[PDB]
Design an enzyme around this catalytic site. Sequence first.
Site, PDB file in Angstrom:
ATOM      1  N   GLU A   1       0.730  -1.233  -0.084  1.00 34.43           N
ATOM      2  CA  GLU A   1      -0.066   0.044   0.038  1.00 34.43           C
ATOM      3  C   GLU A   1       0.839   1.213  -0.137  1.00 34.43           C
ATOM      4  O   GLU A   1       1.928   1.360   0.727  1.00 34.43           O
ATOM      5  CB  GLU A   1      -0.900  -0.006   1.348  1.00 34.43           C
ATOM      6  CG  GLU A   1      -2.241   0.572   1.003  1.00 34.43           C
ATOM      7  CD  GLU A   1      -3.007   0.325  -0.120  1.00 34.43           C
ATOM      8  OE1 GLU A   1      -3.636  -0.656  -0.286  1.00 34.43           O
ATOM      9  OE2 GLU A   1      -3.110   1.188  -1.034  1.00 34.43           O
TER      10      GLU A   1
ATOM     11  N   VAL B   1      -2.995   1.633  -4.354  1.00 35.33           N
ATOM     12  CA  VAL B   1      -2.595   0.486  -4.193  1.00 35.33           C
ATOM     13  C   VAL B   1      -1.745  -0.157  -5.269  1.00 35.33           C
ATOM     14  O   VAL B   1      -2.175   0.269  -6.503  1.00 35.33           O
ATOM     15  CB  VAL B   1      -3.524  -0.880  -3.579  1.00 35.33           C
ATOM     16  CG1 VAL B   1      -4.982  -0.330  -3.678  1.00 35.33           C
ATOM     17  CG2 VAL B   1      -3.369  -2.180  -3.999  1.00 35.33           C
TER      18      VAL B   1
ATOM     19  N   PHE C   1       8.141  -2.467 -13.521  1.00 29.20           N
ATOM     20  CA  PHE C   1       8.336  -3.172 -12.299  1.00 29.20           C
ATOM     21  C   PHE C   1       9.808  -3.059 -11.770  1.00 29.20           C
ATOM     22  O   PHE C   1      10.742  -3.548 -12.752  1.00 29.20           O
ATOM     23  CB  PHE C   1       7.826  -4.666 -12.478  1.00 29.20           C
ATOM     24  CG  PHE C   1       7.797  -5.330 -11.046  1.00 29.20           C
ATOM     25  CD1 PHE C   1       6.871  -4.741 -10.478  1.00 29.20           C
ATOM     26  CD2 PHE C   1       8.653  -6.225 -10.855  1.00 29.20           C
ATOM     27  CE1 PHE C   1       6.463  -5.324  -9.059  1.00 29.20           C
ATOM     28  CE2 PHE C   1       8.477  -6.814  -9.506  1.00 29.20           C
ATOM     29  CZ  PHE C   1       7.599  -6.412  -8.456  1.00 29.20           C
TER      30      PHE C   1
ATOM     31  N   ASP D   1       8.366  14.124  -2.470  1.00 28.23           N
ATOM     32  CA  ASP D   1       8.536  13.160  -1.658  1.00 28.23           C
ATOM     33  C   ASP D   1       9.247  12.017  -1.613  1.00 28.23           C
ATOM     34  O   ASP D   1       8.851  11.072  -1.593  1.00 28.23           O
ATOM     35  CB  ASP D   1       6.823  12.621  -1.351  1.00 28.23           C
ATOM     36  CG  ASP D   1       6.764  11.796  -0.193  1.00 28.23           C
ATOM     37  OD1 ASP D   1       5.715  11.032  -0.060  1.00 28.23           O
ATOM     38  OD2 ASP D   1       7.122  12.023   1.123  1.00 28.23           O
TER      39      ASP D   1
ATOM     40  N   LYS E   1      11.653   9.376  -0.558  1.00 31.15           N
ATOM     41  CA  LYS E   1      12.086   8.465   0.543  1.00 31.15           C
ATOM     42  C   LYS E   1      12.556   7.431   0.192  1.00 31.15           C
ATOM     43  O   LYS E   1      12.526   7.058  -1.044  1.00 31.15           O
ATOM     44  CB  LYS E   1      10.481   8.433   1.500  1.00 31.15           C
ATOM     45  CG  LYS E   1       9.566   7.841   0.743  1.00 31.15           C
ATOM     46  CD  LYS E   1       8.141   8.007   1.591  1.00 31.15           C
ATOM     47  CE  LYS E   1       7.079   7.198   0.900  1.00 31.15           C
ATOM     48  NZ  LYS E   1       6.074   7.546   1.807  1.00 31.15           N
ATOM     49  N   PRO E   2      13.410   6.396   0.916  1.00 34.00           N
ATOM     50  CA  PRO E   2      14.099   5.280   0.585  1.00 34.00           C
ATOM     51  C   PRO E   2      13.000   4.362  -0.017  1.00 34.00           C
ATOM     52  O   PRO E   2      13.395   3.464  -0.960  1.00 34.00           O
ATOM     53  CB  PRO E   2      14.492   4.730   1.914  1.00 34.00           C
ATOM     54  CG  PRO E   2      14.786   5.913   3.017  1.00 34.00           C
ATOM     55  CD  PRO E   2      13.568   6.863   2.493  1.00 34.00           C
TER      56      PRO E   2
ATOM     57  N   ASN F   1      10.678   4.862  -2.166  1.00 36.31           N
ATOM     58  CA  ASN F   1      10.497   5.214  -3.397  1.00 36.31           C
ATOM     59  C   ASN F   1      11.472   4.945  -4.292  1.00 36.31           C
ATOM     60  O   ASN F   1      11.891   5.860  -5.154  1.00 36.31           O
ATOM     61  CB  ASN F   1       9.454   6.299  -3.863  1.00 36.31           C
ATOM     62  CG  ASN F   1       8.968   6.935  -2.822  1.00 36.31           C
ATOM     63  OD1 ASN F   1       7.775   6.680  -2.479  1.00 36.31           O
ATOM     64  ND2 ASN F   1       9.547   8.142  -2.214  1.00 36.31           N
TER      65      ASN F   1
HETATM   66  C1  LIG Z   1       7.023   1.711  -9.518  1.00 33.28           C
HETATM   67  C2  LIG Z   1       5.966   0.795  -8.985  1.00 33.28           C
HETATM   68  C3  LIG Z   1       6.078   0.385  -7.500  1.00 33.28           C
HETATM   69  N1  LIG Z   1       5.698   0.950  -6.444  1.00 33.28           N
HETATM   70  N2  LIG Z   1       6.189   0.434  -5.286  1.00 33.28           N
HETATM   71  C4  LIG Z   1       5.953   1.438  -3.941  1.00 33.28           C
HETATM   72  C5  LIG Z   1       6.584   2.432  -3.689  1.00 33.28           C
HETATM   73 CL1  LIG Z   1       7.595   2.865  -5.284  1.00 33.28          CL
HETATM   74  C6  LIG Z   1       6.330   3.362  -2.698  1.00 33.28           C
HETATM   75  C7  LIG Z   1       5.778   2.728  -1.444  1.00 33.28           C
HETATM   76 CL2  LIG Z   1       5.362   3.511  -0.072  1.00 33.28          CL
HETATM   77  C8  LIG Z   1       5.104   1.548  -1.780  1.00 33.28           C
HETATM   78  C9  LIG Z   1       5.287   0.903  -3.048  1.00 33.28           C
HETATM   79 CL3  LIG Z   1       4.452  -0.654  -3.276  1.00 33.28          CL
HETATM   80  C10 LIG Z   1       7.078  -0.347  -5.652  1.00 33.28           C
HETATM   81  N3  LIG Z   1       7.751  -1.159  -4.646  1.00 33.28           N
HETATM   82  C11 LIG Z   1       8.450  -2.160  -5.349  1.00 33.28           C
HETATM   83  C12 LIG Z   1       9.193  -3.008  -4.129  1.00 33.28           C
HETATM   84  C13 LIG Z   1       8.536  -4.469  -3.786  1.00 33.28           C
HETATM   85  C14 LIG Z   1       8.805  -5.603  -4.728  1.00 33.28           C
HETATM   86  C15 LIG Z   1       8.461  -6.780  -4.602  1.00 33.28           C
HETATM   87  C16 LIG Z   1       7.558  -7.044  -3.578  1.00 33.28           C
HETATM   88  O1  LIG Z   1       7.075  -8.080  -3.563  1.00 33.28           O
HETATM   89  C17 LIG Z   1       7.391  -5.991  -2.740  1.00 33.28           C
HETATM   90  O2  LIG Z   1       6.323  -6.416  -1.526  1.00 33.28           O
HETATM   91  C18 LIG Z   1       7.731  -4.638  -2.637  1.00 33.28           C
HETATM   92  N4  LIG Z   1       8.485  -2.353  -6.382  1.00 33.28           N
HETATM   93  C19 LIG Z   1       7.824  -1.634  -7.562  1.00 33.28           C
HETATM   94  O3  LIG Z   1       7.794  -1.879  -8.584  1.00 33.28           O
HETATM   95  C20 LIG Z   1       7.131  -0.607  -6.865  1.00 33.28           C
END
Ligand SMILES: CCc1nn(-c2c(Cl)cc(Cl)cc2Cl)c2nc(Cc3ccc(O)c(O)c3)[nH]c(=O)c12
Length: 298
Positions: free
Chosen positions: A12, A17, A82, A127, A129-130, A132
């Site tokens: 989230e 989401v 991704f 914004d 942060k580590p 993103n």
């Molecule tokens: C660009 C689309 C994307 N958004 N976020 C994400 C960000 Cl950037 C900030 C926040 Cl606060 C939350 C999320 Cl969700 C992402 N996190 C991951 C890492 C990741 C990779 C595999 C996983 O199973 C997992 O739980 C997390 N990978 C991604 O490709 C991605």
Amino acid sequence: MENFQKVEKIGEGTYGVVYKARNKLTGEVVALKKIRLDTETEGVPSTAIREISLLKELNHPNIVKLLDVIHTENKLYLVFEFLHQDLKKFMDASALTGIPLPLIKSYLFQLLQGLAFCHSHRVLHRDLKPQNLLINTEGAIKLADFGLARAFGVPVRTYTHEVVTLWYRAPEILLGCKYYSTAVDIWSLGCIFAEMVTRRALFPGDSEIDQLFRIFRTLGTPDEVVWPGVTSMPDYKPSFPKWARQDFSKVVPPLDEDGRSLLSQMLHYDPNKRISAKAALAHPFFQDVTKPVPHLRL
Ligand SMILES: CCc1nn(-c2c(Cl)cc(Cl)cc2Cl)c2nc(Cc3ccc(O)c(O)c3)[nH]c(=O)c12
């Protein structure tokens, strides 16, 4: 959306989401962002859609590509490339050794490069942060959610309703400045940077005033000598305690001397003083830059 085989929730994530997904026409594995209700309903604002439609063009190797923008059903869904890991998780996994210097350097060098690109085109993050900051098996790192991070407007409760994180906000914003600049992202990176060396958050505020004061304790309370304009700033209070400037050797050991000049320039109070992303690329700190490949597994 119906062309997407959902694979997993990957977190989230502020404006809504984000799943790992697969597309059936292409066969690509992507990140699908469902953008939170209002902004999603009623209908997206004609402006949200137009601003977002600009992002699509703004392509750089160290920005995560915005692949599509399904505006449909009065819903809004954003389909990004991704990446397998974020930098927070990596830091968390690296906690007992630290991240190696050459890797830190490389990370920093690349992040500066995409912020320069964006900034040139007058687009800011707002914004950083580590969580993103997004890495791959090939020794690379990209900025995620660039320019969203406005077009809709940052959530205070986030999501659901724990808080965002004020840890990385620049003092302008905390002080109620309204028309802030590219320097904000500069402020965040340097907070990110210290965290990589020290293995602790530079300024872990848990409220806006604790965030504010945490900064003033370490960096001094700002006066009109170091920050001309300060006391006229909206939420500035003459009753703010005055703290003294701590010395940088104490705050981020053991960064080298060139590191610490870097840092301090990105930590300058006055916005028009902080180093830009394009000058920072030029700093002696990046003398020895290479491109290590990190230690993941799966
Ligand atoms: C660009 C689309 C994307 N958004 N976020 C994400 C960000 Cl950037 C900030 C926040 Cl606060 C939350 C999320 Cl969700 C992402 N996190 C991951 C890492 C990741 C990779 C595999 C996983 O199973 C997992 O739980 C997390 N990978 C991604 O490709 C991605």
